[PDB]
């Protein structure tokens, strides 16, 4: 819901997520940028880090 709420139609996605009690695993580029972590690409992957 974090990546879809920041694209378009914040109110509708937030309402549906609240009703459904969704959970976000924070495993994408946009979410890791939002919360302030290393993106899972390039030099931010486990082998190189």
């Amino acid at each position: 819901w974090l990546s879809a709420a920041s694209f378009q139609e914040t109110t509708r996605v937030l309402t549906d997520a609240a009703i459904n009690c969704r959970s976000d695993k924070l495993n994408g580029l946009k979410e890791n940028v939002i919360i302030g972590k290393l993106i899972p690409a390039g030099t931010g992957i486990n082998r190189y880090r």
């Binding site: 997520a17 609240a18 009690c21 976000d24 924070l26």
Partner: protein
């Protein structure tokens, strides 16, 4: 805090019990700020009792003004003796009839 320890972000509907849990006090008067004394009112929208001291290690009265008296709640005013950065993270609530 460490960002490398987060694992989830859950959202859901909030009940009245949760709203009464998060709050640190109930606001009653619609007043905002004292124009002449330049100090927050009581039980208003900017009150020091509900939200926190406007200045560091201070309170509404002048009984405690030093850094060694932290942790003590003023018994005549009700204001905590702590930092002023706690006004960015403490909420309140309104009791609807």
């Amino acid at each position: 805090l460490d960002v490398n320890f987060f694992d989830e972000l859950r959202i859901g509907l909030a009940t009245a019990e949760d709203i009464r849990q998060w709050s640190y006090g109930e606001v009653k008067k619609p007043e905002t700020i004292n124009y002449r004394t330049l100090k927050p009112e009581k039980d208003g929208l900017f009150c020091e009792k509900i939200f926190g001291p406007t200045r560091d290690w201070e309170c509404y009265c002048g009984k405690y003004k030093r850094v060694r008296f932290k942790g003590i709640i003023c018994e005549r005013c009700g204001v905590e003796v702590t930092r002023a950065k706690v006004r960015r993270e403490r909420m309140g609530h309104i009791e609807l009839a």
